């Protein structure tokens, strides 16, 4: 009775706000405390949850402008009673359809008591039965919450409605959640995903730990799902899930877009980083209009495996990209100490993934996998895959393998050690004949580069398109042409034409070369102009060597050592000075001089 | 009276430190609590602020070695009374000029009650009237503070003095703040900037949210301003400001330098990332000596726009760099769903920005903008701009546009889709004739690359300087020269000289080519040496083909199919074996054999 | 007595858990409170430490499932008494050998009272005498702990046992700690390292500050040491230590592996980022089998110096890599305002470091250092060093210097300003003759590139291996060969062979060139084929120009302007049409026509 009076004084002090115990909460692990929570929450004061295990017979419903703070994880614990039926998340905002505003949740454990339902049980339908569900809310801060024994998800951010909407690709669901911060939270023992987002935007997930789902379906640590956009994940860890971070959508929904991963650590997940859009992977169906923009950096993947048998024994991956446009990966380290856990492909880019770049990758220990990096395309216009600055330490019988449908690949600065690999084949392999490649270095791979069946073991540099080097300006260069070592005014405008070491010299001659020349022009076919000034070759097989101010216009007509002559004869070699002075006539077997032809000569 | 005694016992327990209520604070939203705060703060104990709205009639002044902790944002709230005049920040350190030490502020709302002044009002002068001002302090930790309705800034870190110092570029202001940590803070409804730094160093800003200024001037989410240096920003979000993160200085001050952005999300700002130095942009004034070193990664920009009319309707940008030297951008995603919000340039590098690199960029949705990336230079020595691994999804009529004053550009692995763009022009365009380019891929752009007026639609690779390929060592190669497919000892030392497929062969001959040769040398002009051994061409237009141990020293003198001859005749083709044996004399029209000249021959 | 009763009511309320004061703690800076701590900790309740300085005469031992929370740093302070002897860390888990589970520590200062021992004193042996030692524990969360005046380390995570195990390289010590989170902690005035890990895995270190060791040995801010693996460090700061972040091992231990640095700021450390494996640096001893996989991004280094004389006056570094395989650095900014602090090398990659990549580097102010970036190798197979997108502002007499033992280097997009440097030499220098280089830009360096003694000041592009440009497919190209500007079916299969501007043309001729041709083949040596169709040159020095369906099989035998002839003569020029029709015989000095040889000709 005296104690009651002292407590009344303490309560009135409101040192933390109002304690739930002030409204009758026992926190004794037995008594139903729901009414105390509802009373405290409806009072308008910030609510404090002190030490205890606070049992509730139904979900805790949160109105707008709620502050709910506990004494800390495994200190303040909130828990469903054994007798609770189906349908409710443990904690969720009051207005399920159009949402609430300004909800600040901190420092307690949510224990969903899934075990009360027996084993192997997940959510009854849609977004129902997570530990924490936030639906259509603006301005929600979720901090230092531990979510355990969850029926559906640990923490779910979604749009209005108990069900998830399936409106088709290219849509935006009404009533998104917006401005959400999830920090220093933990999710484990969940039936679907640890921390997940749907149909919501402007979300930061920082320093959280999601691990060990109860089930072996599509059970992910962090699941950026249907309708998500404008999300940052940073410095989180996942462990022992299917996907570490999954970014996706189901088929009848828009894929998450514009997602940033600013560092992550994945420990013994199946597919550490798994980006996909279900239903938008086949070549015979349209591209996803939603699956776009993922920038992911400083990614760690450790011992990816499928010991638990997730997803019908799906094969492990450090990284798997499918469906998405515009995925940029920078700074990826994959490490394993057990060669038998992942034996197919370490990193895959396939199934309509397009315009993807990988830079700064180290893959170590995958000595019984078939491929380190494996890429497949669809011969799509404007597509590209860039792979640079990759080092492989006993990872992949094929280090970097490029398959069919890839027309635009850049592969630069790849190195590999294959001495510890079970039956290595090639550091780099391509199906397509025209990859761009440079900077390959290897030891212990029998072949370094296999390009469309041809092996290169002593280094290679391959570039595509019109080529120009050591020339500061030029006119047009054909894609099967080149200009090198020249000054201004040159052009090599047709297939198989080129200019070397020249000035103001142009070729429009299919199968031709101009070298060492000035103000010269080739415009027939099979033309050669060498060491000449003001030379023109304008007929098939016409040529000039060491000639000035001369034009060879004959079929197979070659001019040598001449100035100021124009020749038109077929199969003739000519020379002269201001006029034709000799001829070797291959056609008729005649030799002609303007002056004399003589034997018995000396040169003294 | 009994309650008073119970409270005395509670107070004496000091469970949090000392409560301000112990010193007479009411926290009732009405009573002036300033004396209680001052008494508690001067006591030497850590101070606790429990639930309440604590009104104050003047600024709360903080001495050295202060710990001030509240019950949490929107729980413990500190607020200026309606009657407060002008001149004071709500909370600031005691020693305004030489500063204080060891101040730890946590878990409360600061409400500046700017509305008491009417609307449209900002700070009265210098650093006066922010919610929180830290001046010349060392070791300050600011955590979980919400700053609302601010007259000047939300949170300001500055040097000693109420005014900001304007000492000119290249200076360091006395009495900096140093070792500051700002974490999980929010700033909104401010008159200038949300969270800002001036003239201070060693600062980490982490996981903060700054949004919605009251005014439409230079009102930024995060403003790294005048005199700042050695600052890290990471995992913050800005929304609805002018600049998301601005890094700059005014004209009469040194620019912030050595600044790191380790991830950021910008939502509906005008210029998400805005780096500049006012007064140091013109070509006719000197470069900033202070604007240097920005490394920014994992940057997100969403729907940049100027609907609010900030800064006289400044045009929106995902990124704008001006004035700065040494800006490195890696991993940038810009996304919009409204083509009409930003119609000028998505990313700009101009106005004395120099030595800037962009890698790993995805820009999506900017289908009515003129330029995706736009770069302008000043023909500065040692300057460079590197653009690599960029993909554009309906963003920019010109995808990557390089303007005047750029002598050194590297543009690699750019891809674009232009089918959804309003009147697309070219994926890549340059004014300068000598960009370095490779790895372009596009669909829906009428032109792929336009290089100084010339179009390339079928791929291109352009490199600058002396060129060498498939040759492990060589002597000198001129910048208008090349050596390919050769072994050691070759050189191509003058303009328009080159060596192919040779060994120990050298040319110093302007307009020349040596191919398929050994120990050969060209040293005249217009020289050709092919398939030869020990061949020398040392006069204008001299040449040798299929010759051994021979020297052509005549003007337009060609040697064919020979061994061991030296010729000097003008306009002569010669052949021989240990001595000259025939001549075709183009000059005089003579044909000469040492032995016989005959007709009627057969070859059997 | 009444106060005692009120307190009993308060205690029973358990608002924070149980206060240590409930078990008799005074927290008066004098009374020994150890028994109160032990009693509170053994009770099974979460333990709260309120305001006070809580003295203890022996270490606080932590059992499994402990929650220990204070009122905050410099609020709740825990401190060794002056009389405490040697051997114990201030706070550590109970089971030193096989460890404990689920320990959550938050919000207090640990004061090790090292000063009680006099000055210059460090730990008595192994892991003994840190402020906080965690040995063989799973699931430990360490948050907002300030560790001061530490005898050994501030915070140490290690395997079971008081000693550290020295089991040799390539081992894994029993009983690791696992799943550790260290956040918002501070360590200073320590004898060895601030925050350190040994023989443990799955660790995140976030937003911590480690600075100012008492001693000048190997005293690091963050020390990822012997046996560590799978660690992320992000957004920490180090100041005034030897290493900012050190990743290493001692000689008789395995190096830390698979470590990620997701942003860091190093202030006035000696070697900001220092990666090494003691005993595994010499060329005459084996490579580390453990030192692998470091990905480090967004790294800041400020004024590195050795004013304090750490480590026998070790020379300062922004970055030093030795021993490690697979180090990826992206986004590094080094800045100094004092040229005299670091005068040797800014960034070094040496001493068995291999397969390292640096991208996006800005180094500013190091105007009296010998080298900006300095790299040395060991001629190791599969090795590579990639340096790209680097800008230097008055940093390094040699900007990028590559030394001996490097066979595989890629150096791209390097720029430098050297006008402010004391006696600059070259932007780029290499010892090896075959670096791959492009995109160099400089001002104020007397030489731009010095490649094995040869200077290049006007730009250079150098590539290695078989070369191909403007050709979409080909057969084999030798590493001393090339194909350019050609269509399918070509090959240049031997040393010094090449094909230009041709179709279906092949050379296996050492020292050869085919240009402007179709279906042609060179298979002797010193062969030239130009502007020809169906041409074969199959003898030494054989050649064809403007020839169709012809074969030159003679020694030094040239065919000109011909169709359908096969020649075999030595030192002969021939022409013909379906049969040989003329010959110039260099061997014997004969001129032969099938028909007539005549003088007195005109061409009209
Ligand atoms: Na899932
Ligand atoms: Na899902
Ligand atoms: Na501003
Ligand atoms: Na400002
Ligand atoms: Na150490
Ligand atoms: Na150590």
Short mmCIF file of C-alpha atoms in Angstrom, two decimals, chain A residues 2-4 6-7 10-11 15-16 19 21 48-52 71 73-75 143-144 146 183-184 186 207-209 211 234-237 239 262-265 267-268 297-303 330-335 337 359-364 389-394 413-417 433-435 438-443 451 454-467 478-484 495-498 500 510-513 526-528 530 541-543 545 556-558 560 571-574 580-598, chain C residues 2 5-7 9-10 12-18 44-47 65 67 69 102 104 139 141 143 178-181 183-184 201-204 206-207 230-235 257-263 292-298 325-328 330 354-355 357 359 380-384 386-388 408-410 412 436 461 463-479 484-487 499-503 513 515-518 530-533 545-548 560-563 573-577 579-584 591-603:
data_model
loop_
_atom_site.label_atom_id
_atom_site.label_comp_id
_atom_site.label_asym_id
_atom_site.label_seq_id
_atom_site.Cartn_x
_atom_site.Cartn_y
_atom_site.Cartn_z
CA UNK A 2 2.91 2.34 0.82
CA UNK A 3 4.73 0.84 -2.17
CA UNK A 4 1.69 1.71 -4.29
CA UNK A 6 5.74 5.50 -3.91
CA UNK A 7 5.05 4.00 -7.37
CA UNK A 10 7.47 7.59 -9.67
CA UNK A 11 4.81 7.19 -12.40
CA UNK A 15 11.23 9.95 -16.38
CA UNK A 16 11.00 7.91 -19.63
CA UNK A 19 5.72 3.11 -18.38
CA UNK A 21 3.47 -0.88 -15.92
CA UNK A 48 8.33 3.09 -22.13
CA UNK A 49 8.68 -0.68 -21.74
CA UNK A 50 10.93 -1.59 -18.80
CA UNK A 51 12.50 -4.95 -17.93
CA UNK A 52 10.15 -7.91 -18.39
CA UNK A 71 14.91 -1.07 -21.87
CA UNK A 73 16.75 -6.24 -26.56
CA UNK A 74 16.46 -9.27 -24.24
CA UNK A 75 15.55 -6.79 -21.50
CA UNK A 143 15.99 0.92 -34.09
CA UNK A 144 17.60 -1.79 -31.96
CA UNK A 146 15.37 -7.95 -32.16
CA UNK A 183 18.91 0.28 -37.94
CA UNK A 184 20.73 -2.12 -35.64
CA UNK A 186 18.10 -8.42 -35.87
CA UNK A 207 23.84 -2.32 -39.48
CA UNK A 208 21.19 -5.07 -39.18
CA UNK A 209 21.68 -8.83 -38.83
CA UNK A 211 19.93 -15.03 -40.17
CA UNK A 234 24.64 -0.64 -45.79
CA UNK A 235 26.86 -2.59 -43.39
CA UNK A 236 24.28 -5.30 -42.76
CA UNK A 237 25.11 -9.01 -42.35
CA UNK A 239 23.82 -15.61 -42.40
CA UNK A 262 26.80 0.24 -49.71
CA UNK A 263 28.71 -2.75 -48.29
CA UNK A 264 27.34 -6.09 -47.04
CA UNK A 265 28.64 -9.31 -45.49
CA UNK A 267 27.93 -15.67 -44.42
CA UNK A 268 26.99 -19.20 -45.60
CA UNK A 297 29.83 -2.07 -53.69
CA UNK A 298 32.14 -3.56 -51.06
CA UNK A 299 30.33 -6.91 -51.13
CA UNK A 300 31.58 -9.84 -49.08
CA UNK A 301 30.52 -13.43 -49.67
CA UNK A 302 31.74 -16.27 -47.43
CA UNK A 303 31.34 -20.06 -47.97
CA UNK A 330 32.45 -2.65 -57.56
CA UNK A 331 34.65 -4.33 -54.96
CA UNK A 332 33.49 -7.90 -54.52
CA UNK A 333 35.29 -10.51 -52.49
CA UNK A 334 34.14 -14.12 -52.49
CA UNK A 335 35.91 -16.59 -50.25
CA UNK A 337 37.60 -22.89 -47.57
CA UNK A 359 35.05 -4.20 -61.35
CA UNK A 360 37.48 -5.11 -58.58
CA UNK A 361 36.65 -8.74 -57.89
CA UNK A 362 38.65 -11.32 -55.93
CA UNK A 363 37.35 -14.90 -55.91
CA UNK A 364 39.28 -17.37 -53.77
CA UNK A 389 40.25 -5.89 -62.56
CA UNK A 390 39.38 -9.44 -61.56
CA UNK A 391 41.69 -11.88 -59.80
CA UNK A 392 40.93 -15.55 -59.29
CA UNK A 393 42.64 -17.79 -56.80
CA UNK A 394 41.89 -21.41 -57.69
CA UNK A 413 42.93 -7.02 -66.42
CA UNK A 414 41.95 -10.54 -65.48
CA UNK A 415 44.42 -12.72 -63.61
CA UNK A 416 44.15 -16.25 -62.29
CA UNK A 417 45.95 -19.03 -60.47
CA UNK A 433 34.51 -14.02 -82.12
CA UNK A 434 34.85 -10.30 -81.25
CA UNK A 435 35.29 -9.77 -77.51
CA UNK A 438 43.45 -6.93 -72.73
CA UNK A 439 45.67 -7.53 -69.70
CA UNK A 440 45.31 -11.29 -69.11
CA UNK A 441 47.80 -13.00 -66.73
CA UNK A 442 47.69 -16.61 -65.57
CA UNK A 443 49.53 -19.58 -64.10
CA UNK A 451 38.34 -16.95 -78.30
CA UNK A 454 41.27 -20.22 -81.00
CA UNK A 455 43.78 -20.25 -78.13
CA UNK A 456 46.00 -17.37 -77.02
CA UNK A 457 48.56 -18.26 -74.38
CA UNK A 458 51.18 -15.52 -74.79
CA UNK A 459 49.04 -12.42 -74.28
CA UNK A 460 46.41 -10.65 -76.32
CA UNK A 461 44.91 -7.26 -77.04
CA UNK A 462 41.66 -7.16 -79.07
CA UNK A 463 39.73 -3.99 -79.96
CA UNK A 464 36.63 -3.43 -82.09
CA UNK A 465 35.45 -0.85 -84.62
CA UNK A 466 37.25 1.75 -86.69
CA UNK A 467 40.79 1.99 -85.31
CA UNK A 478 35.46 2.50 -91.73
CA UNK A 479 34.84 -0.12 -89.01
CA UNK A 480 37.05 -2.46 -91.08
CA UNK A 481 39.69 0.21 -91.55
CA UNK A 482 42.43 2.10 -89.71
CA UNK A 483 44.72 5.13 -89.72
CA UNK A 484 48.01 5.12 -87.78
CA UNK A 495 36.03 -1.99 -95.82
CA UNK A 496 39.67 -3.16 -95.75
CA UNK A 497 41.26 0.22 -96.32
CA UNK A 498 44.03 1.83 -94.29
CA UNK A 500 49.89 4.54 -92.32
CA UNK A 510 38.37 -1.76 -100.91
CA UNK A 511 41.52 -3.79 -100.08
CA UNK A 512 44.12 -1.06 -100.03
CA UNK A 513 47.03 0.53 -98.21
CA UNK A 526 43.45 -3.70 -104.50
CA UNK A 527 45.44 -0.43 -104.45
CA UNK A 528 48.89 0.10 -103.01
CA UNK A 530 53.96 3.65 -100.91
CA UNK A 541 45.13 -3.44 -108.82
CA UNK A 542 46.73 -0.09 -109.68
CA UNK A 543 49.70 0.93 -107.55
CA UNK A 545 55.83 3.14 -105.27
CA UNK A 556 47.13 -4.18 -112.55
CA UNK A 557 49.16 -1.08 -113.55
CA UNK A 558 52.15 -0.31 -111.31
CA UNK A 560 57.79 2.97 -110.01
CA UNK A 571 49.21 -5.40 -116.69
CA UNK A 572 52.01 -2.86 -117.17
CA UNK A 573 54.79 -1.63 -114.93
CA UNK A 574 55.73 1.92 -116.00
CA UNK A 580 56.27 7.78 -119.76
CA UNK A 581 59.85 6.59 -120.38
CA UNK A 582 59.75 2.79 -119.95
CA UNK A 583 57.32 -0.09 -119.78
CA UNK A 584 57.41 -3.75 -118.76
CA UNK A 585 54.34 -5.22 -120.47
CA UNK A 586 53.21 -8.35 -118.61
CA UNK A 587 50.18 -8.74 -120.93
CA UNK A 588 52.08 -9.07 -124.24
CA UNK A 589 55.67 -9.74 -123.09
CA UNK A 590 57.07 -6.49 -124.46
CA UNK A 591 59.78 -4.30 -122.93
CA UNK A 592 59.86 -0.67 -124.10
CA UNK A 593 62.21 2.29 -123.58
CA UNK A 594 61.66 5.79 -124.95
CA UNK A 595 65.43 6.06 -125.61
CA UNK A 596 67.69 2.97 -125.74
CA UNK A 597 67.70 -0.62 -124.51
CA UNK A 598 71.27 -1.97 -124.19
CA UNK C 2 12.59 5.92 5.02
CA UNK C 5 12.29 1.86 1.95
CA UNK C 6 11.66 4.17 -1.02
CA UNK C 7 14.81 2.76 -2.69
CA UNK C 9 10.34 0.10 -3.99
CA UNK C 10 12.40 1.66 -6.82
CA UNK C 12 11.70 -3.76 -7.15
CA UNK C 13 10.30 -1.76 -10.09
CA UNK C 14 13.28 -2.87 -12.21
CA UNK C 15 12.90 0.03 -14.68
CA UNK C 16 16.28 -0.69 -16.36
CA UNK C 17 16.67 -4.28 -15.20
CA UNK C 18 18.59 -4.44 -11.90
CA UNK C 44 20.03 -13.64 -14.21
CA UNK C 45 18.65 -10.12 -14.72
CA UNK C 46 19.84 -7.48 -17.20
CA UNK C 47 22.24 -5.28 -15.25
CA UNK C 65 23.42 -14.40 -21.55
CA UNK C 67 23.08 -7.75 -20.62
CA UNK C 69 24.05 -1.37 -19.84
CA UNK C 102 25.13 -13.83 -25.94
CA UNK C 104 25.45 -7.40 -24.82
CA UNK C 139 27.09 -13.39 -30.32
CA UNK C 141 27.47 -6.82 -29.18
CA UNK C 143 28.18 -0.57 -28.25
CA UNK C 178 32.24 -15.46 -33.79
CA UNK C 179 29.43 -12.97 -34.61
CA UNK C 180 30.81 -9.83 -33.00
CA UNK C 181 29.62 -6.26 -33.46
CA UNK C 183 29.95 0.03 -32.75
CA UNK C 184 30.38 3.63 -31.65
CA UNK C 201 35.41 -14.36 -37.60
CA UNK C 202 32.18 -12.56 -38.67
CA UNK C 203 32.94 -9.23 -37.10
CA UNK C 204 31.66 -5.74 -37.93
CA UNK C 206 31.48 0.46 -37.25
CA UNK C 207 31.75 4.16 -36.39
CA UNK C 230 35.61 -12.20 -42.48
CA UNK C 231 35.74 -8.75 -40.88
CA UNK C 232 34.13 -5.49 -42.04
CA UNK C 233 35.39 -2.12 -40.89
CA UNK C 234 33.31 0.90 -41.88
CA UNK C 235 33.23 4.62 -41.08
CA UNK C 257 42.05 -12.86 -44.66
CA UNK C 258 38.87 -11.71 -46.46
CA UNK C 259 38.74 -8.29 -44.86
CA UNK C 260 36.65 -5.37 -46.08
CA UNK C 261 37.23 -1.69 -45.38
CA UNK C 262 34.03 0.17 -46.32
CA UNK C 263 35.37 3.70 -45.77
CA UNK C 292 44.57 -13.02 -49.24
CA UNK C 293 41.52 -10.93 -50.17
CA UNK C 294 41.37 -7.34 -48.96
CA UNK C 295 38.80 -4.99 -50.50
CA UNK C 296 39.19 -1.42 -49.31
CA UNK C 297 37.24 1.60 -50.56
CA UNK C 298 36.64 5.27 -49.78
CA UNK C 325 47.46 -11.58 -52.64
CA UNK C 326 44.30 -9.95 -54.04
CA UNK C 327 44.11 -6.41 -52.65
CA UNK C 328 41.56 -4.13 -54.35
CA UNK C 330 39.05 1.94 -54.90
CA UNK C 354 50.72 -9.58 -55.71
CA UNK C 355 47.56 -9.17 -57.79
CA UNK C 357 44.57 -3.08 -58.08
CA UNK C 359 41.63 2.78 -58.91
CA UNK C 380 55.60 -14.37 -60.44
CA UNK C 381 53.30 -16.24 -62.82
CA UNK C 382 49.70 -15.08 -62.78
CA UNK C 383 50.75 -11.81 -61.08
CA UNK C 384 49.36 -8.39 -62.06
CA UNK C 386 46.56 -2.50 -62.15
CA UNK C 387 46.83 1.25 -61.56
CA UNK C 388 44.07 3.42 -63.05
CA UNK C 408 52.36 -7.59 -65.89
CA UNK C 409 51.43 -3.91 -65.29
CA UNK C 410 48.49 -1.90 -66.52
CA UNK C 412 45.91 3.90 -67.33
CA UNK C 436 50.78 -1.48 -70.68
CA UNK C 461 49.73 3.94 -75.82
CA UNK C 463 49.66 -2.83 -75.42
CA UNK C 464 50.98 -6.38 -75.10
CA UNK C 465 50.36 -9.72 -76.82
CA UNK C 466 48.80 -10.67 -80.13
CA UNK C 467 47.09 -7.55 -81.47
CA UNK C 468 43.90 -7.20 -83.53
CA UNK C 469 41.89 -4.10 -84.46
CA UNK C 470 39.00 -3.37 -86.89
CA UNK C 471 38.61 -7.11 -87.60
CA UNK C 472 35.55 -8.96 -86.27
CA UNK C 473 37.03 -12.47 -86.53
CA UNK C 474 40.30 -14.14 -87.41
CA UNK C 475 42.29 -17.31 -87.00
CA UNK C 476 45.48 -17.39 -84.92
CA UNK C 477 47.62 -14.29 -84.28
CA UNK C 478 51.12 -14.76 -82.81
CA UNK C 479 52.09 -12.62 -79.78
CA UNK C 484 44.04 -5.00 -88.70
CA UNK C 485 41.29 -3.67 -90.97
CA UNK C 486 40.44 -7.10 -92.33
CA UNK C 487 37.50 -9.45 -92.82
CA UNK C 499 47.90 -8.89 -92.18
CA UNK C 500 46.36 -5.53 -93.04
CA UNK C 501 43.25 -4.66 -95.09
CA UNK C 502 42.73 -8.16 -96.42
CA UNK C 503 40.28 -11.02 -96.67
CA UNK C 513 53.30 -8.47 -94.44
CA UNK C 515 48.16 -5.91 -97.24
CA UNK C 516 45.26 -4.97 -99.54
CA UNK C 517 44.78 -8.58 -100.62
CA UNK C 518 42.37 -11.52 -100.90
CA UNK C 530 50.44 -6.24 -101.64
CA UNK C 531 47.25 -5.48 -103.56
CA UNK C 532 46.94 -9.04 -104.77
CA UNK C 533 44.32 -11.78 -105.30
CA UNK C 545 52.61 -6.71 -105.86
CA UNK C 546 49.44 -6.11 -107.97
CA UNK C 547 49.31 -9.79 -108.90
CA UNK C 548 46.45 -12.27 -109.39
CA UNK C 560 54.66 -7.47 -110.51
CA UNK C 561 51.52 -6.52 -112.40
CA UNK C 562 50.60 -10.09 -113.35
CA UNK C 563 47.95 -12.77 -113.73
CA UNK C 573 61.65 -9.76 -110.96
CA UNK C 574 59.01 -11.33 -113.24
CA UNK C 575 55.73 -10.40 -114.85
CA UNK C 576 53.32 -12.23 -117.08
CA UNK C 577 49.77 -13.12 -118.09
CA UNK C 579 52.64 -17.45 -118.71
CA UNK C 580 55.87 -15.61 -117.78
CA UNK C 581 56.34 -12.71 -120.24
CA UNK C 582 59.32 -10.71 -118.90
CA UNK C 583 62.21 -10.99 -116.48
CA UNK C 584 64.73 -8.65 -114.88
CA UNK C 591 66.72 -8.64 -119.28
CA UNK C 592 64.25 -10.93 -121.09
CA UNK C 593 60.98 -10.42 -122.97
CA UNK C 594 58.87 -13.19 -124.50
CA UNK C 595 58.10 -10.89 -127.47
CA UNK C 596 60.22 -7.79 -128.24
CA UNK C 597 62.60 -5.44 -126.45
CA UNK C 598 62.73 -2.02 -128.18
CA UNK C 599 63.91 1.56 -127.81
CA UNK C 600 62.51 4.63 -129.58
CA UNK C 601 59.01 4.19 -128.16
CA UNK C 602 56.26 6.71 -127.55
CA UNK C 603 53.03 6.28 -125.60
#
